[PDB]
Design a protein around this ligand. Structure first.
Ligand SMILES: C[C@H]1CNC[C@H](CO)C1
Length: 165
């Protein structure tokens, strides 16, 4: 039921869309969150997804952290998708603004391979500070399952499509 996506490869699709609106429309089995190790969904994609859940994502996340401790950079956990999806896969890409190793972006994308189909943002893009062109490249070269990428910014979406090798 994903509609309006441009096909980049055999398994990677892209659309200029607000991932919250896309999740509400599609109700995918998995929506990926651009999480941090503490699951503190303050801003960027995480802040927007959490706000769409009326903070239920944050309440669930705080209980998860209280039980399990923080995630690793490059790691993930599966939690509820609330009103957005069946599940939310919280994936921690490296935050270059915190000096985290950009080489961990491939490990972060490997989490997507545990799910046959996902709605996702570009990991480490936006407020995480990585080059979104590089994130898309790592995505296509790492993810083998079906990934539907939602890119919020039209100007960035156009740049990503027009520069895609
Ligand atoms: C598994 C269902 C979850 N919501 C959308 C799916 C259609 O691609 C069906």
């Amino acid at each position: 039921s994903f509609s309006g996506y441009l096909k980049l490869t055999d398994n990677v699709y892209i659309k200029n869309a607000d991932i919250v609106e896309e999740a509400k429309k599609v109700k995918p089995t998995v929506v990926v969150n651009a999480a941090n190790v503490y699951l503190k969904h303050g801003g960027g994609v995480a802040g927007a997804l959490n706000k769409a859940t009326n903070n239920a994502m944050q309440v669930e996340s705080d209980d998860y952290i209280a039980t399990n401790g923080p995630l690793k950079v490059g790691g993930s956990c599966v939690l509820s998708g609330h009103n957005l999806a069946k599940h939310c896969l919280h994936v921690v890409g490296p935050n270059v603004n915190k000096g985290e190793d950009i080489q961990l972006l491939k490990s972060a994308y490997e989490n997507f391979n545990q799910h046959e189909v996902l709605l996702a943002p570009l990991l480490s893009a936006g407020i995480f500070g990585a080059d979104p062109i590089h994130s898309l490249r790592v995505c296509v070269d790492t993810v083998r399952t079906n990934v539907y990428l939602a890119v919020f910014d039209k100007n960035l979406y156009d740049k990503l499509v027009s520069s895609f090798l």
